[PDB]
A paper describes a structure:
The third enzyme is 2-C-Methyl-d-erythritol-4-phosphate cytidyltransferase (IspD), 4-diphosphocytidyl-2-C-methyl-d-erythritol (CDPME) is formed from MEP by reaction with CTP12. The core of the enzyme consisted of a seven β-sheets (β2, β1, β4, β9, β5, β8, β10) where all strands were parallel, apart from β8 and β2.
Furthermore, the structure of BsIspD/CTP-Mg2+ complex was determined, the final model revealed two molecules in one asymmetric unit, named molecule D and E, respectively. These two subunits can be superimposed with a r.m.s.d of 0.63 Å for 215 Cα. Moreover, the average B factor of the main-chain and side-chain of the molecule D was about 20 Å lower than that in the molecule E, which implied that molecule D was in more stable state than molecule E. Six residues (227–232) in the C-terminal of two molecules were missed in the final model. In addition, the ribose was hydrogen bonded to Pro8, Gly11, Gly105 and Ala106 (Gly11 N-ribose O2′ = 3.0 Å; Pro8 O-ribose O3′ = 2.9 Å, Gly105 N-ribose O3′ = 3.3 Å and Ala106 N-ribose O3′ = 3.3 Å). The triphosphate wrapped around a magnesium ion, coordination bonds were formed between the magnesium ion and the oxygen atoms of α-, β-, γ-phosphate in CTP. In the BsIspD/CTP-Mg2+ complex, it was clearly seen that the P-loop had shifted away from the active site upon CTP binding, and it changed from beta-alpha (β-α) form to alpha-beta (α-β) form32. The Cα atoms of Gly11,Gln12 and Arg15 shifted 4.4 Å, 7.6 Å and 7.9 Å, respectively, in this way, the P-loop did not interact with residues Asp84, Asp104, Ala106, and Lys 209 anymore, the active pocket was open to accommodate CTP, the P-loop and the residues Lys209 and Ala106 were involved in the interactions with CTP. Meanwhile, it was observed the L2-loop shifted about 2 Å, the residue Thr211 was hydrogen bonded to the residue Arg15 in the P-loop (3.5 Å).
Author numbering:
A (entry chain A): 1 to 226
B (entry chain B): 1 to 9, 21 to 226
Amino acid sequence: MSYDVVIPAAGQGKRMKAGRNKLFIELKGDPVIIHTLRVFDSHRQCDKIILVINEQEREHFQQLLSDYPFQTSIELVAGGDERQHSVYKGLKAVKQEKIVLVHDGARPFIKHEQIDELIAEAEQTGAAILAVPVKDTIKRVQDLQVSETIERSSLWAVQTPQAFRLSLLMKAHAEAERKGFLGTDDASLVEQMEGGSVRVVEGSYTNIKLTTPDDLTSAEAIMESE
Amino acid sequence: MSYDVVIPANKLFIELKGDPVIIHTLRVFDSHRQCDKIILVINEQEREHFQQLLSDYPFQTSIELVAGGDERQHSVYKGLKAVKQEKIVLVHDGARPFIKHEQIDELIAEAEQTGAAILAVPVKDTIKRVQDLQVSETIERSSLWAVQTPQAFRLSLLMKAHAEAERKGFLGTDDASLVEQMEGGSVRVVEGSYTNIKLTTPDDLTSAEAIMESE
Ligand SMILES: Nc1ccn([C@@H]2O[C@H](COP(=O)(O)OP(=O)(O)OP(=O)(O)O)[C@@H](O)[C@H]2O)c(=O)n1
Ligand SMILES: [Mg+2]
């Protein structure tokens, strides 16, 4: 029942345009990454947190973490140039075979309820993601000019966490690294493997990712609402 | 220079800070000098409910209620028959109240220059096709855009588009699809704003309230 969580936090936050890691931005007085860490530190089934960071920020994370009452162990692991590389470095720090969750540092509003439903699906079938139905029309665009329209009734917008049996995720990462496949999520690595299957748990539209400046306004309102 | 806007219709009476979302949306087109007419397409049996709304919220810009078919595509078509001469027509979701005139002008500017346009933003999330709560494929993310409204077209061009799409069986999801599908159909894309959100659910209202107070 017990899991480890790998939290990629090693990005620069270029689209957020804060002039520093977006994850140090304060929401209601506490950095984004502190909100995210708190969800896992307060969740009884989380044994360990592996937080993947840019090595230049390590002393800053050391300080930052010492100011807060985290009781669960938090290991700082250096990341890489892309999220996938960062995730793989974090996963190599997990010590025993078990269920592992990978969760973006930039999603601070994940709830214990959804974490619970994912771990259950991963335990049964191996690989589970949070997701929500797409509501907008999606099209592909070449040089600000439409090339085609994707059918939407079956389309879903994927969230984190994504939950996996460690062995299965490590195998997906190792194959992807050897072949040069760079996926945008951990699920797509598993999908690329022969016989790879991923299941969907419906998530909350409040589990937003903080990516652009307008996402900070949505974030403040979600906080105030709860 | 000047456009009509067709708005196809109830969820639109959901409120945002005291007023139905449709009234916030109407205000934007009413405050825009290049908007000559607003055509609001409705179910014929709700004509009184709408008359009442428009009585309570007087607008200076001309607003015409028109009877609407059983689907958005048919409603938009019915709406377009109420446009009286050749010009740019917008088609806009009533539940998108935060459209800015700046974006509206770019949409027109492009659809006069080249015939058809849409507002859109880059997709931020990974998108998967899912069948029975099991992933079937991941859609390649890189050149993906989330489409908003309004969508702006030369009337002849779009009514032409509705004409041929009527002639085949083709039911569309939005209207830009009708342009892209027949002929050598070209739709340019104007990068919109992530604030141009659609309001249906109560989580949506939570965001909308925040956007309003922010600006
Ligand atoms: N090389 C990277 C890039 C991203 N991430 C992390 O992966 C999560 C999702 O990535 P994204 O939202 O793109 O964050 P950034 O890459 O930092 O932002 P941008 O793409 O706008 O630079 C973030 O918590 C980010 O810190 C990471 O650990 N290593
Ligand atoms: Mg990134």
